Amino acid sequence: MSVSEIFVELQGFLAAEQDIREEIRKVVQSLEQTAREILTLLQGVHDIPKRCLKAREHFSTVKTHLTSLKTKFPAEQYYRFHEHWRFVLQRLVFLAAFVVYLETETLVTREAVTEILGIEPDREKGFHLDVEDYLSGVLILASELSRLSVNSVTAGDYSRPLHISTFINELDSGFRLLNLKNDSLRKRYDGLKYDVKKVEEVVYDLSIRGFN
């Protein structure tokens, strides 16, 4: 083709792609919104089960909104616009993990988060939760949890710290089994040591003071 032809045609393609980036940014703007709302419901901790339920309830909207975001591009092109919802997906994993931790004191599985976010497993096509974002959200949870232990002592709840300690310590232990390569992820993992250290000191302050 002639230069002119080539470019008028690439103009089409460009505009078609910018449409997609727009539809995705639209929904992602909805997700970050909901995520903030869920954060507040939960942040209240600083009636757990009620907060947890109103939160799992909010995740409902994330389910429909995500299946909506699912129709703004062909599934096989997920990873092309990943960076438009990375931040959000990592927050939502954290929030889901936070809910599960608060109600069972356990670590949501990657497969269980997919279920909560109306997402589907890697087996299928469409929207999926990659291992790096999950590990990310989990690390964010450790940060939240270490902060929580602090506040629980000033709330008078001298037991949570001890459970959180064992939990974060297990996470630390978990991450030790991995040989992280990703620059962002590793820079974050380097923060676990601080959360781990903080919780151990909180436990220490209690042990010395009497409770245990």
Site for its own copies in 96-115 (CB under 8 A): 104, 106-107, 109-112
How many binding residues for its own copies (CB under 8 A)?
A: 74
Among 66, 167, 188, 189, binds its own copies (CB under 8 A): 167
Least Å distance, CB 66 to its own copies, is 18
Of 164, 172, 173, the closest CA to residue 203 belongs to 164
Least Å distance, CB 198 to its own copies, is 9
Among 26, 186, 187, 209, binds its own copies (CB under 8 A): 209
Among 178, 184, 186, 187, binds its own copies (CB under 8 A): 178
Q: Is 70 in the site for its own copies (CB under 8 A)?
A: no
Q: Is 201 in the site for its own copies (CB under 8 A)?
A: yes
Interatomic CA distance for residues 3 and 126, integer angstroms: 36
From residue 27 to residue 46, what is the string marking binding to its own copies with x (rule CB under 8 A)?
Answer: --x--xx--x--xx--x--x
* Binders in 76-95 for its own copies, by CB under 8 A: 76-80, 82
Least Å distance, CB 67 to its own copies, is 19
Interatomic CA distance for residues 67 and 204, integer angstroms: 47
* Binders in 179-198 for its own copies, by CB under 8 A: 179-181, 193, 196-197
Q: Is 6 in the site for its own copies (CB under 8 A)?
A: yes
